[PDB]
Symmetry: C2
Subunit: 192 residues, 2 copies
């Protein structure tokens, strides 16, 4: 059975960008729920023995929605850090410059993609087959994990539960918080 | 151009099932935003002259998402009432009994569809071409308004902004609030 991964940092470590309360419901209830629902769904199917990633890459319907959300949220918690934020560094900063000319142009581009990602969704920084970076949006539980040759490097959860407590309807403010928390080390770890 | 309709009741009339705060955000910011967005999208286009319903039934993309959302929310405010709730009445009470055998089976069928309506969504009580009632789920801005011969009779908004402030992650509690508020007069007007 799958388990709810621990949060990589204290429940208040993301303040004042993401609240202790948001983390309590988002990790504690939302993430958790996906884990208990999947655990309940797999027994008696050709999924009980397989990897979380294996399932996400070979299911649909309910099993997919749950397995993919578990994966996406775990990747999301890692995309933030009490020590992230600020300028990108290393290999990712460079690929960012190679593709968008500048960090600022990339940030504007991602913000644009995320603010207009309609409904429950995720906005991703990914690495394509050519080694170049790109930004892609997915709806609901969809994830670049199921794209052969497309490597996820960072994600931002845009479901309303991710920011409603702290920011209500204002996604731009939430995005300002994400940029104060973005984990460039996890990004570079994934890019390399 | 389009305007935000007035709520059919006082900002605190749905208390304690849906809060004054939820109404201020849901009606005052979200509903309003779709209206500003549409008005900002139709000028000098093949939709500037059309009515809301004509636009929703002849667009896609951004224009569809905003027009439909304005329509769906308006229909949602009408599906609630400080004088609604309790047992269904009149023609709809009888049409529910005809399809599901009883009000209780209908309520459990709708609750099941609504709690499992994945991501941002809407659950509708609709009247079909054959005249029989049914429950259908739509995602994001999709609405039965675009299905010929299908008549929307009531809707429950399941986007998380509809209940997060009041119930956080617990859709079942929000659903309990909806049943205390359901507008059977609105439903009977749509049915007849
Ligand atoms: Fe989430
Ligand atoms: Fe809504």
């Amino acid at each position: 059975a799958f388990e709810l991964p621990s949060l990589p940092y204290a429940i208040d470590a993301l303040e004042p960008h993401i609240s202790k309360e948001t983390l309590e419901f988002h990790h504690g209830k939302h993430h958790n729920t996906y884990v208990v629902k999947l655990n309940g769904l797999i027994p008696g199917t050709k999924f009980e023995n397989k990897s979380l990633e294996e399932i996400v890459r070979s299911s649909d319907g309910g099993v997919f929605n749950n397995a993919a959300q578990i994966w996406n949220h775990t990747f999301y918690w890692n995309s933030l850090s009490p020590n992230g934020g600020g300028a990108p560094t290393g290999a990712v900063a460079d690929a960012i410059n190679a593709k968008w000319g500048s960090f600022d142009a990339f940030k504007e581009a991602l913000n644009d993609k995320a603010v207009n990602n309609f409904g429950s969704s995720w906005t991703w920084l990914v690495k394509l087959a050519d080694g170049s970076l790109d930004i892609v949006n997915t709806s609901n539980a969809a994830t670049p994990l199921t794209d052969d040759g497309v490597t996820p490097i960072l994600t931002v959860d845009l479901w309303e539960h991710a920011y409603y407590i702290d920011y209500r309807n204002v996604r731009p403010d939430y995005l300002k918080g994400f940029w104060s928390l973005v984990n460039w080390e996890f990004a570079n770890a994934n890019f390399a």
